[PDB]
RNA sequence: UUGGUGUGUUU
């Protein structure tokens, strides 16, 4: 374990394919830096997974790494206002606000992290059909 | 799931949708002009990965920072018998005369935010006034009134039609009638009226 | 002049090849066969007794989605012009159901096959739940446990898709004409080259390719269509097609009569 | 009726920016230093380098809203293949005989230079065109 | 909660006609017809069918707002034709084509069984 | 929750094909291939059964309310 | 808070939506908001009939 | 939550300051008055006793 | 916030309870449709009714004395659609044109002459745009020193109100003063300028219906060769910043007026990576086709600009805080994945990637700090703006 | 048909 004070005195690579110095020019992938400054590094730490830098209302988002980050902040601060299933005992509980969304689907862009907020077993929305096309000015 | 938000602008019945070659119609149509400045290209990547994982029938790992490129998704959508970059040739529902540009089209995960319109519609003729100041009350829950605030009065001054302002701050509010003695100038004058 | 060409037929779908009509008339057929087919479904629901794990209008909603037989339906009138104040046996198919998990252990699936027609303006075979095979238990309405008394009473009245889409006659309609774009009505978006990347239609092999030396036949028009009218099971596809044309005739004829009566 | 007539040499074609519209530049045969440029549609009338073009400008195709044409009537255009209507938008008496007429075919263009003795009648408002062959 | 009826798509009111004509006196021999209680499904079919005829010159329809089940159409034919007559003949031809269509379809399903 | 009746996009009735789908899953099928056998070919009636996740079992886990 | 600016009546408030099938000086009114708010039109000699109907 | 109060409009305590790797959320924070303050403990947070 | 922010209107009664607008009035109120609230005060007298109807009505507040220009123009779809409509190579059959000219409330009843008579009558869309704009207009513009021969087909000359040539875009019909709308206002009063927006928007919506327009993930992709060229260019830029490091950390660098050594160092860095971003985005703009959707939208100007397409496809550029490169939040480094004292662009927040390829996590986080700047700005300096504006008012 | 504090969310 490290807290923010030992974060001062460490040296991280991000993914375990970057620990061994790797092998091109393919226009699909992503470009890690070379880290050719230290010829002989002493890495002491490597991340378990980078999508573990997120918050709980942030790991829900499908591919956060392809957006303009105010929209990431907006999606995380809207994910809390989903209609869905809040706890499974809404028969006996008496609460001043409760709303069940009828037909909740686990998203086809699930993560690997949504196993650990159970959201694939309690979702709060649906898959409906996207069609990004100006049709009659109603989506101006 | 990328903030491209908004309200249900309009409702169309089933036939009036555009519809692709198989019969699939859509249900939610975000705007082209919602995209190119907001720069949310992840939303397109989600729609594409969605359509592929629907057709090959399983849930594709969209946890970020993998080697999942766009190229694998492109090749798989093509090699399962489709266009490579999403589009299908969609139609007018009012003619069937083909939509000149091919339309991008798929499933995506949607959600429902807690606001509705049935909780923020409110209008008010009259009604509940406070005892303390006789100006109409504050809050939705007691059917209050709106705050025709400072800077609204500022723009009324800018237009200048102050007779509207004398409507607003006299007549749809605490219109109130007092008396003055013309010598000491005050409002101490006790008012009995049926004895006058 | 106009010519029909059935290509496949089975009972869940039909893929025909309507040839030599205008484009508007074929798409008008499409709009009819989603929208204006008079059929029959569950219109007012009255729970006699419910104690379920599911709420009430929930189950009335799901019952509204349930496919009935309406083969005989045009000798049943519309609800809002049938000569009764509230429901009688001239225009209803009253389902009263009470399955009941008697015995205090286990799972009770109220299916479509247990749904009972009690009355109906018979003996028109309406309002039966549609059965794939006859061993088709079917639509998953409820899961009941210990003593959970579910006694429901439905009415069935006659609406179209315009009121609501629980009266959808049918499911999904393919539609295409000129699969090789010989009118250039459509324009491909393309990275590299238009011919390679857009894969051929399922009706590509029913016609020829274009030849590169040919000019743009500007006086040509679209002339051969293909559509796919599947079934929910509520009707059979031939009956769907027939009555959709029939209804569209009747609307056009009413427009004609209002012309001639204003005249 | 026809106020122009000449025959032209196709020297350049610019498809370029437009997939359906091309720009020709035709230098006259019968009297040179008569330069003619006409933007044109490919797929109504494809043209090619070094062909022959009979070019005619008229002001009335008789020998107010447009209905589509009957069969019973007839036009000057009946012996032609690409008929565009235009508007005379800029008429500039230039140099010695640098006399430039700018007539626009509604998004399409037509520059014409040459002798005064040909172009002298052209000072109008609505001028057609009628390409033969 | 201000949600209206969804039988406003086909049922006419009481003292409103189903077919409300007003002749447009800007140009000669043109008419405006206020159809009640429909959508495109009538209109496009009438449009292309009125298009190909010779004597018809101008015919065009608009749906003013798709959250209202009405639409209005413009109809100018040539000089001679009362255009109402032409539209009635148009209905005649359409039902002729479709009844032929139903006929051969019945025959073809008879064979295909 | 529990399977809906039609598709959301098209409108082919699917609700019957839940129990058959689980029984096909019991033998070790793959989910796309199972949808293939049930004749689900548009993706509309593929997302209406593929996504769907089941809560009403959890509601019957409540040992009797009455 | 109460004199220079205050709260008042005959207001209304909602959430909006675009609608290009409109002029430039037109704004859509939901029906219930038209029911709640009103306007005093003077009974004159040129508007009796409609106003009696609006009573009816 | 963070008690600077709201007295001081200073953008130094509202920065996403770069000790935040895996400890708070670089996405989540509300819109407006709270922004820069409110820190959601990350999906690898633990609180030392 | 300005004297249009209250405007009078007229009443249209609709079910389905929300407020309807025109979308040309979206610009003056500054409203989007992610849930705004707009109020509705009502007059209670005859006097105030006439007050509103003669002053605060929209057709009398078109021209803002803020900047003596019209501030009510065209927005997203009507604009990018009309630019797709009146390109030169756009032809329409007669039948669809019947409806399109039926939509104009001010059309007389006369079609134009179709700009081709034979072999099959077509139009071009500029005459249909000419149907809306009334009789008595002139507008002459020279962009870039065009001719009267017009090879690039930009520029604009209008006589009679019938278009003669030119791609009608934002810099004619947007908010720009001396544009089309201002000219109509000066030459025809308010009411015809009111009907201008009606005519144009209804026309181009009907046509942008029957055409259609969309945007797909391919539209931000260029071919592999241009990707190679952009990669080579930005790699050469990183070579240039390596030269900067080499000379400055070998103390070969000359100091600008008024800035000391680190300030001119960072200023050099800022210019050099901005040059990288500009040339790379320029190449990626140059390759893209014109049936490409995104280039049509930016070349219409209804939404977005050059830097949008550069950031989506070629390079996002340097992540900033307060104009500068990113502070070493820790000692000598601005995360714990880096070394000490490395002023390389990938350290202090230059996204080398596109948006499309994916970010390395560090680059994602530095863009999060960019959004953090934007959030704190938009919810902190509006304090000072409100207080200043109140004081100038009083 | 309360006041008065305080919290979170919308633009
Ligand atoms: Mg906003
Ligand atoms: Zn006194
Ligand atoms: Zn009866
Ligand atoms: Zn489906």
mmCIF file of N, CA, C and O and ligand atoms in Angstrom, chain C residues 171-172, chain F residues 6-14 40 42-49, ligand 4:
data_model
loop_
_atom_site.group_PDB
_atom_site.id
_atom_site.type_symbol
_atom_site.label_atom_id
_atom_site.label_comp_id
_atom_site.label_asym_id
_atom_site.label_seq_id
_atom_site.Cartn_x
_atom_site.Cartn_y
_atom_site.Cartn_z
ATOM 1 N N UNK C 171 -44.530 -6.969 -37.337
ATOM 2 C CA UNK C 171 -43.283 -6.861 -36.609
ATOM 3 C C UNK C 171 -42.201 -6.035 -37.282
ATOM 4 O O UNK C 171 -41.722 -5.069 -36.688
ATOM 5 N N UNK C 172 -41.774 -6.403 -38.486
ATOM 6 C CA UNK C 172 -40.614 -5.733 -39.062
ATOM 7 C C UNK C 172 -40.619 -5.861 -40.580
ATOM 8 O O UNK C 172 -40.785 -6.948 -41.122
ATOM 9 N N UNK F 6 -42.773 -8.330 -26.844
ATOM 10 C CA UNK F 6 -42.325 -8.050 -28.186
ATOM 11 C C UNK F 6 -40.862 -7.684 -28.123
ATOM 12 O O UNK F 6 -40.241 -7.699 -27.062
ATOM 13 N N UNK F 7 -40.329 -7.343 -29.275
ATOM 14 C CA UNK F 7 -39.106 -6.573 -29.323
ATOM 15 C C UNK F 7 -39.411 -5.132 -28.987
ATOM 16 O O UNK F 7 -40.551 -4.706 -29.092
ATOM 17 N N UNK F 8 -38.402 -4.381 -28.578
ATOM 18 C CA UNK F 8 -38.599 -2.944 -28.437
ATOM 19 C C UNK F 8 -38.554 -2.238 -29.776
ATOM 20 O O UNK F 8 -39.369 -1.348 -30.041
ATOM 21 N N UNK F 9 -37.601 -2.608 -30.627
ATOM 22 C CA UNK F 9 -37.514 -1.969 -31.930
ATOM 23 C C UNK F 9 -38.572 -2.516 -32.882
ATOM 24 O O UNK F 9 -39.504 -1.790 -33.245
ATOM 25 N N UNK F 10 -38.501 -3.789 -33.260
ATOM 26 C CA UNK F 10 -39.432 -4.219 -34.282
ATOM 27 C C UNK F 10 -40.816 -4.524 -33.754
ATOM 28 O O UNK F 10 -41.735 -3.759 -34.045
ATOM 29 N N UNK F 11 -40.985 -5.555 -32.934
ATOM 30 C CA UNK F 11 -42.304 -6.018 -32.556
ATOM 31 C C UNK F 11 -42.602 -7.471 -32.869
ATOM 32 O O UNK F 11 -43.762 -7.814 -33.095
ATOM 33 N N UNK F 12 -41.583 -8.312 -32.946
ATOM 34 C CA UNK F 12 -41.764 -9.756 -32.973
ATOM 35 C C UNK F 12 -41.893 -10.264 -31.541
ATOM 36 O O UNK F 12 -41.100 -9.899 -30.674
ATOM 37 N N UNK F 13 -42.941 -11.043 -31.271
ATOM 38 C CA UNK F 13 -43.188 -11.518 -29.910
ATOM 39 C C UNK F 13 -42.105 -12.513 -29.537
ATOM 40 O O UNK F 13 -41.860 -13.475 -30.268
ATOM 41 N N UNK F 14 -41.432 -12.274 -28.415
ATOM 42 C CA UNK F 14 -40.271 -13.072 -28.052
ATOM 43 C C UNK F 14 -40.405 -13.756 -26.708
ATOM 44 O O UNK F 14 -39.633 -14.674 -26.426
ATOM 45 N N UNK F 40 -33.696 -15.699 -34.521
ATOM 46 C CA UNK F 40 -33.608 -14.281 -34.198
ATOM 47 C C UNK F 40 -32.519 -13.702 -35.080
ATOM 48 O O UNK F 40 -31.331 -13.900 -34.837
ATOM 49 N N UNK F 42 -32.712 -10.271 -37.077
ATOM 50 C CA UNK F 42 -32.432 -8.857 -36.864
ATOM 51 C C UNK F 42 -31.844 -8.707 -35.481
ATOM 52 O O UNK F 42 -32.164 -9.484 -34.587
ATOM 53 N N UNK F 43 -30.998 -7.700 -35.275
ATOM 54 C CA UNK F 43 -30.497 -7.522 -33.918
ATOM 55 C C UNK F 43 -31.530 -6.940 -32.957
ATOM 56 O O UNK F 43 -31.245 -6.855 -31.762
ATOM 57 N N UNK F 44 -32.704 -6.535 -33.438
ATOM 58 C CA UNK F 44 -33.721 -5.998 -32.546
ATOM 59 C C UNK F 44 -34.221 -7.078 -31.605
ATOM 60 O O UNK F 44 -34.120 -6.961 -30.375
ATOM 61 N N UNK F 45 -34.595 -8.210 -32.167
ATOM 62 C CA UNK F 45 -34.901 -9.357 -31.336
ATOM 63 C C UNK F 45 -33.642 -10.101 -30.923
ATOM 64 O O UNK F 45 -33.708 -11.291 -30.604
ATOM 65 N N UNK F 46 -32.476 -9.467 -31.005
ATOM 66 C CA UNK F 46 -31.312 -10.045 -30.353
ATOM 67 C C UNK F 46 -30.939 -9.262 -29.109
ATOM 68 O O UNK F 46 -30.461 -9.834 -28.127
ATOM 69 N N UNK F 47 -31.175 -7.958 -29.117
ATOM 70 C CA UNK F 47 -30.927 -7.206 -27.902
ATOM 71 C C UNK F 47 -32.103 -7.328 -26.959
ATOM 72 O O UNK F 47 -31.972 -7.081 -25.762
ATOM 73 N N UNK F 48 -33.266 -7.729 -27.464
ATOM 74 C CA UNK F 48 -34.378 -7.818 -26.536
ATOM 75 C C UNK F 48 -34.311 -9.083 -25.709
ATOM 76 O O UNK F 48 -35.086 -9.254 -24.773
ATOM 77 N N UNK F 49 -33.416 -10.002 -26.048
ATOM 78 C CA UNK F 49 -33.257 -11.169 -25.195
ATOM 79 C C UNK F 49 -31.827 -11.269 -24.680
ATOM 80 O O UNK F 49 -31.594 -11.715 -23.554
HETATM 81 ZN ZN1 LIG K 4 -36.490 -7.370 -32.025
#
